[PDB]
Ligand binder design. Structure first.
Ligand SMILES: [Ca+2]
Lengths: 99, 124
Protein backbone atom coordinates (compact mmCIF):
# COMPACT_ATOMS: atom_id res chain seq x y z
CA UNK A 1 0.00 0.00 0.00
CA UNK A 2 1.66 3.22 -1.23
CA UNK A 3 0.55 6.48 0.36
CA UNK A 4 -1.57 4.85 3.06
CA UNK A 5 -1.56 4.73 6.85
CA UNK A 6 -1.00 2.04 9.46
CA UNK A 7 -4.35 0.37 10.17
CA UNK A 8 -5.56 0.39 13.76
CA UNK A 9 -4.60 -3.01 15.16
CA UNK A 10 -7.27 -5.64 14.38
CA UNK A 11 -9.60 -3.00 12.86
CA UNK A 12 -9.61 -5.01 9.60
CA UNK A 13 -10.64 -8.39 11.05
CA UNK A 14 -11.37 -10.06 7.68
CA UNK A 15 -7.84 -9.33 6.37
CA UNK A 16 -5.60 -12.38 6.10
CA UNK A 17 -1.99 -12.89 5.09
CA UNK A 18 -1.17 -15.78 2.76
CA UNK A 19 2.15 -17.32 3.78
CA UNK A 20 4.26 -19.95 2.05
CA UNK A 21 7.53 -19.45 3.87
CA UNK A 22 6.95 -15.67 3.61
CA UNK A 23 4.03 -13.30 3.19
CA UNK A 24 3.18 -13.33 -0.53
CA UNK A 25 -0.50 -12.26 -0.89
CA UNK A 26 -3.49 -10.99 1.01
CA UNK A 27 -6.97 -12.44 1.22
CA UNK A 28 -10.38 -11.97 2.79
CA UNK A 29 -12.24 -14.20 5.24
CA UNK A 30 -15.80 -14.61 3.94
CA UNK A 31 -17.07 -17.37 6.25
CA UNK A 32 -15.74 -19.46 9.13
CA UNK A 33 -13.83 -21.79 6.82
CA UNK A 34 -13.42 -20.00 3.46
CA UNK A 35 -11.06 -17.28 2.23
CA UNK A 36 -11.27 -15.29 -1.05
CA UNK A 37 -8.05 -14.17 -2.78
CA UNK A 38 -6.61 -13.54 -6.26
CA UNK A 39 -6.16 -16.31 -8.81
CA UNK A 40 -2.58 -15.22 -9.40
CA UNK A 41 -1.87 -15.99 -5.71
CA UNK A 42 -2.26 -19.70 -6.42
CA UNK A 43 0.31 -21.88 -4.68
CA UNK A 44 0.18 -25.62 -4.06
CA UNK A 45 0.72 -25.08 -0.30
CA UNK A 46 -0.63 -22.06 1.59
CA UNK A 47 -0.87 -21.18 5.28
CA UNK A 48 -3.56 -18.62 6.09
CA UNK A 49 -2.65 -16.24 8.91
CA UNK A 50 -5.65 -14.52 10.47
CA UNK A 51 -5.71 -11.96 13.26
CA UNK A 52 -2.43 -10.42 12.09
CA UNK A 53 -1.27 -6.86 12.56
CA UNK A 54 2.55 -7.00 12.62
CA UNK A 55 3.35 -10.05 10.49
CA UNK A 56 6.89 -10.45 11.91
CA UNK A 57 5.99 -10.37 15.63
CA UNK A 58 3.69 -12.72 17.56
CA UNK A 59 1.30 -10.32 19.31
CA UNK A 60 -1.44 -12.56 20.67
CA UNK A 61 -4.38 -12.81 18.25
CA UNK A 62 -2.86 -14.88 15.44
CA UNK A 63 -4.59 -17.91 13.99
CA UNK A 64 -2.38 -19.98 11.65
CA UNK A 65 -4.56 -22.40 9.64
CA UNK A 66 -3.29 -24.31 6.62
CA UNK A 67 -5.32 -24.44 3.43
CA UNK A 68 -7.10 -27.77 2.87
CA UNK A 69 -8.37 -26.85 -0.61
CA UNK A 70 -7.16 -24.17 -3.01
CA UNK A 71 -9.65 -23.64 -5.84
CA UNK A 72 -8.85 -21.19 -8.63
CA UNK A 73 -11.57 -19.96 -10.98
CA UNK A 74 -11.70 -22.39 -13.94
CA UNK A 75 -11.64 -19.55 -16.48
CA UNK A 76 -8.70 -17.73 -14.86
CA UNK A 77 -6.46 -16.42 -17.64
CA UNK A 78 -2.80 -16.15 -16.69
CA UNK A 79 -1.96 -13.71 -19.48
CA UNK A 80 -4.82 -11.19 -19.06
CA UNK A 81 -5.70 -11.88 -15.39
CA UNK A 82 -9.36 -12.17 -16.36
CA UNK A 83 -11.29 -14.03 -13.63
CA UNK A 84 -8.53 -13.30 -11.08
CA UNK A 85 -10.15 -15.04 -8.14
CA UNK A 86 -9.31 -18.00 -5.90
CA UNK A 87 -11.04 -19.69 -2.96
CA UNK A 88 -9.23 -21.28 0.00
CA UNK A 89 -10.96 -23.74 2.33
CA UNK A 90 -9.29 -23.69 5.73
CA UNK A 91 -8.39 -27.06 7.22
CA UNK A 92 -10.28 -25.96 10.35
CA UNK A 93 -12.90 -23.25 10.89
CA UNK A 94 -11.46 -19.94 12.00
CA UNK A 95 -12.41 -18.79 15.49
CA UNK A 96 -14.66 -15.75 14.99
CA UNK A 97 -13.60 -13.66 17.98
CA UNK A 98 -14.89 -10.25 16.81
CA UNK A 99 -18.55 -9.37 17.47
CA UNK B 1 -11.20 -12.05 13.23
CA UNK B 2 -14.53 -12.01 11.43
CA UNK B 3 -15.94 -12.50 7.95
CA UNK B 4 -16.71 -9.75 5.44
CA UNK B 5 -19.99 -9.96 3.56
CA UNK B 6 -20.25 -10.65 -0.15
CA UNK B 7 -21.53 -7.71 -2.20
CA UNK B 8 -25.21 -7.27 -3.05
CA UNK B 9 -24.58 -4.97 -6.05
CA UNK B 10 -21.68 -4.20 -8.41
CA UNK B 11 -19.25 -1.37 -7.61
CA UNK B 12 -20.49 2.20 -7.99
CA UNK B 13 -18.20 5.00 -9.15
CA UNK B 14 -17.23 7.42 -6.36
CA UNK B 15 -17.74 4.97 -3.48
CA UNK B 16 -15.13 5.45 -0.76
CA UNK B 17 -13.45 2.08 -0.17
CA UNK B 18 -10.91 0.61 2.24
CA UNK B 19 -7.93 -1.21 0.68
CA UNK B 20 -5.45 -2.98 2.95
CA UNK B 21 -2.37 -5.15 2.81
CA UNK B 22 1.27 -5.75 3.65
CA UNK B 23 2.50 -4.92 0.16
CA UNK B 24 5.29 -2.55 -0.78
CA UNK B 25 4.82 1.01 0.47
CA UNK B 26 7.10 2.67 -2.13
CA UNK B 27 6.80 3.46 -5.83
CA UNK B 28 10.60 3.33 -6.25
CA UNK B 29 12.56 0.60 -4.57
CA UNK B 30 10.99 -1.45 -1.82
CA UNK B 31 9.94 -1.06 1.80
CA UNK B 32 7.79 -3.95 2.95
CA UNK B 33 5.95 -3.02 6.16
CA UNK B 34 5.65 -5.16 9.24
CA UNK B 35 2.32 -3.57 10.21
CA UNK B 36 -0.86 -3.75 8.12
CA UNK B 37 -1.44 -0.68 5.94
CA UNK B 38 -4.74 0.95 5.05
CA UNK B 39 -5.84 3.23 2.24
CA UNK B 40 -9.15 5.01 1.61
CA UNK B 41 -9.76 5.36 -2.13
CA UNK B 42 -12.80 5.87 -4.37
CA UNK B 43 -14.06 3.59 -7.09
CA UNK B 44 -13.33 5.15 -10.48
CA UNK B 45 -15.79 5.25 -13.35
CA UNK B 46 -15.82 2.50 -15.97
CA UNK B 47 -14.74 5.03 -18.64
CA UNK B 48 -11.80 6.26 -16.54
CA UNK B 49 -10.71 2.65 -16.02
CA UNK B 50 -10.91 1.78 -19.72
CA UNK B 51 -9.28 5.07 -20.72
CA UNK B 52 -6.42 4.21 -18.35
CA UNK B 53 -5.95 0.65 -19.68
CA UNK B 54 -7.32 0.59 -23.23
CA UNK B 55 -8.58 -2.82 -24.32
CA UNK B 56 -7.43 -4.54 -21.10
CA UNK B 57 -10.41 -4.05 -18.77
CA UNK B 58 -12.93 -6.88 -18.89
CA UNK B 59 -16.39 -6.95 -17.35
CA UNK B 60 -14.74 -8.74 -14.39
CA UNK B 61 -12.44 -5.84 -13.48
CA UNK B 62 -12.86 -2.33 -12.12
CA UNK B 63 -10.54 0.46 -11.02
CA UNK B 64 -10.10 2.07 -7.60
CA UNK B 65 -7.83 4.92 -6.59
CA UNK B 66 -6.50 8.18 -7.97
CA UNK B 67 -5.62 9.14 -11.53
CA UNK B 68 -3.05 11.56 -10.07
CA UNK B 69 -1.27 8.62 -8.43
CA UNK B 70 0.41 8.86 -5.06
CA UNK B 71 -1.89 6.35 -3.30
CA UNK B 72 -2.34 2.79 -4.56
CA UNK B 73 -1.97 -0.89 -3.80
CA UNK B 74 1.34 -2.51 -4.75
CA UNK B 75 3.43 -5.69 -4.84
CA UNK B 76 2.44 -7.97 -1.98
CA UNK B 77 -1.09 -6.57 -1.68
CA UNK B 78 -2.43 -8.96 -4.36
CA UNK B 79 -5.47 -10.92 -3.26
CA UNK B 80 -6.42 -8.51 -0.48
CA UNK B 81 -9.68 -6.64 0.06
CA UNK B 82 -11.46 -3.58 -1.22
CA UNK B 83 -14.34 -2.99 1.18
CA UNK B 84 -17.21 -0.52 1.35
CA UNK B 85 -20.39 -0.56 3.46
CA UNK B 86 -19.55 -3.90 5.00
CA UNK B 87 -19.19 -5.69 1.65
CA UNK B 88 -16.19 -7.05 -0.26
CA UNK B 89 -16.34 -5.25 -3.61
CA UNK B 90 -12.87 -5.98 -4.98
CA UNK B 91 -9.74 -8.12 -4.84
CA UNK B 92 -6.33 -6.51 -5.45
CA UNK B 93 -5.40 -7.74 -8.93
CA UNK B 94 -3.01 -5.69 -11.09
CA UNK B 95 -1.87 -2.29 -12.35
CA UNK B 96 1.00 -0.46 -14.03
CA UNK B 97 3.54 0.33 -11.36
CA UNK B 98 2.29 1.59 -8.02
CA UNK B 99 0.75 5.03 -7.48
CA UNK B 100 1.86 6.11 -10.97
CA UNK B 101 -0.01 8.86 -12.78
CA UNK B 102 -2.84 7.67 -15.06
CA UNK B 103 -2.34 4.12 -13.73
CA UNK B 104 -4.85 3.31 -10.97
CA UNK B 105 -5.23 -0.07 -9.37
CA UNK B 106 -7.26 -2.76 -11.13
CA UNK B 107 -9.39 -5.03 -8.97
CA UNK B 108 -11.44 -8.18 -9.49
CA UNK B 109 -15.19 -7.40 -9.50
CA UNK B 110 -16.29 -9.78 -6.69
CA UNK B 111 -20.01 -9.27 -7.39
CA UNK B 112 -19.62 -11.17 -10.68
CA UNK B 113 -18.57 -14.29 -8.72
CA UNK B 114 -21.18 -14.34 -5.96
CA UNK B 115 -22.79 -17.45 -7.47
CA UNK B 116 -19.43 -19.10 -8.22
CA UNK B 117 -18.42 -18.56 -4.60
CA UNK B 118 -21.64 -19.98 -3.14
CA UNK B 119 -21.68 -22.89 -5.60
CA UNK B 120 -18.04 -23.79 -4.92
CA UNK B 121 -18.55 -23.64 -1.15
CA UNK B 122 -21.62 -25.90 -1.37
CA UNK B 123 -19.80 -28.46 -3.53
CA UNK B 124 -16.82 -28.62 -1.17
CA1 LIG C 1 1.82 -11.10 14.23
Amino acid sequence: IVGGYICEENSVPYQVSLNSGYHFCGGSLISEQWVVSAGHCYKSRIQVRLGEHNIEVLEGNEQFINAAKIIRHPKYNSRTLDNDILLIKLSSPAVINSR
Amino acid sequence: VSAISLPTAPPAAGTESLISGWGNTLSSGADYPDELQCLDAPVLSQAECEASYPGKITNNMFCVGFLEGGKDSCQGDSGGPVVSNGELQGIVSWGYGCAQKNRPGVYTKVYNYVDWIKDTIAAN
